[PDB]
Nucleic acid binder design. Structure first.
Lengths: 98, 99
DNA sequence: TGCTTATCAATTTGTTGCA
DNA sequence: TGCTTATCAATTTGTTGCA
């Protein structure tokens, strides 16, 4: 399972009866549109209805974890504050199973 | 700040690639067909810019008596049963867009 | 009448912030 | 975690203004 993006390019290119090079071409630009938008603190909604959003994640300190299998305490490095791209589904995405 | 809708996204894509807006949509519409066919056939699928689609099941939740603080209304929720729902997940190629 | 009405209004149904 | 959360957002459906 788990159809990859390269398989998706081919899957779409075959259905539309078009070269896969154009398929990646159109998608590569869409990618740039998204990145440049989020870099300018915009919100974007893309097919099939996914909304892109810049958001702030508050810093999290360190805390030493433990591994059950290897039995060695494993420290996680404290994660400072940073921005993260948050996506969330919208109307047609859930409707896809109707 | 304004928000880019998928319609004005088609036009941004259509101008940047120097192609008709109709073909830009004919491909995203096709992408919508493929994605849906996969989920209804219980298969994950990753799309650009690196979003993964998984169909998952949610567990039922009962009713609860709410209260709208603007109204003063005590309002009622309808208990929501078990059902299917698709979940997405931001693969890290998407977080790298802020690099 | 009937609208790509209209920083609509009233509505149910997720999603986020913070104590 | 869950709210008598938020002047939230994102849906869905009803009413009005204006040509």
């Amino acid at each position: 399972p788990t159809i990859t993006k390269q398989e998706l390019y081919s899957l779409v290119a075959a259905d539309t009866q078009l070269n896969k090079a154009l398929i990646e071409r159109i998608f590569t630009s869409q990618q740039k549109i998204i990145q440049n938008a989020l870099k300018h603190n915009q919100e974007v909604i893309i097919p099939p209805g996914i909304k892109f959003t810049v958001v702030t994640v508050k810093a999290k300190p360190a805390r030493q974890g433990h591994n059950p299998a290897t039995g060695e305490p494993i420290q996680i490095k404290a994660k400072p504050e940073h921005k993260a791209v948050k996506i969330r589904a919208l109307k047609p995405v859930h409707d896809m199973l109707n």
